[PDB]
């Protein structure tokens, strides 16, 4: 659509990017759907790792989830200086999830090497019935409680391709 549009401007910026939230919260299926499907992923350092290096253009993202290998935290979050951007996804429909995921936000956001990054929280999966709207977002994760830095939240939904443009916009416009 016009998304399409935002796709390929968002493509040749040059940027680094983190794309951070719990398992299953949507990060790989909102990397296909903004790449159209068609991306190079690799392991960092390594295989074995699961952090990972999403290129595709000018683009780097540098994707993990919270809590897939507790022991590498440190390592992952130190990898994260310099983006422009932070961009923490939650499932904002699995509201049992909701606290221990503001929580590591929270901890992540009290690091000092990553004071100043901008954080887009994306609560994704809106298209399911009942799934926490923007305000209640802010509200149930505690949004306004970071004001060291520049923070928004949008709801989304990669399944249906709803507010996927507006993230864009966002991104787009944050590089350095
Ligand atoms: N209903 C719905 N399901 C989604 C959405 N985005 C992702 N999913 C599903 O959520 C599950 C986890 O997706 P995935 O991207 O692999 O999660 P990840 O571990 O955060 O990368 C998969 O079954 C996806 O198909 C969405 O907007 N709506």
């Known amino acids: 659509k016009l998304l399409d549009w935002f796709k390929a401007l968002f493509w040749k910026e040059e940027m680094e990017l983190t794309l951070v939230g719990l398992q299953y919260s949507g990060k790989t299926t909102f990397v296909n759907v903004i790449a ?3 991306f190079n992923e690799d392991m960092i350092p390594t295989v074995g790792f699961n952090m990972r290096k999403i290129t595709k253009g000018n683009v ?3 994707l993990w989830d919270i809590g897939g290998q507790p022991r590498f935290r440190s390592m992952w979050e130190r990898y994260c200086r310099g983006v422009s951007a932070i961009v923490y996804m939650v499932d904002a429909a699995d ?3 909701i606290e ?3 929580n590591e936000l929270h901890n992540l956001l009290d690091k000092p090497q990553l ?4 954080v887009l929280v994306l609560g994704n999966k809106r298209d399911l019935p009942g799934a926490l709207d923007e305000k209640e977002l802010i509200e149930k994760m505690n949004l306004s409680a970071i004001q ?3 923070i ?4 989304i939904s990669c399944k249906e391709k709803d507010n996927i443009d507006i993230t864009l916009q966002w991104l787009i416009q944050h590089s350095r």
């Open 60 to 62: 780097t993202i540098k």
């Open 95 to 97: 509201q049992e999830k």
């Open 36 to 38: 159209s499907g068609q």
């Open 100 to 102: 221990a995921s503001k």
């Open 148 to 150: 060291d830095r520049e």
């Open 152 to 155: 928004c939240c949008y709801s």
């Open 115 to 118: 004071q100043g990054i901008p």
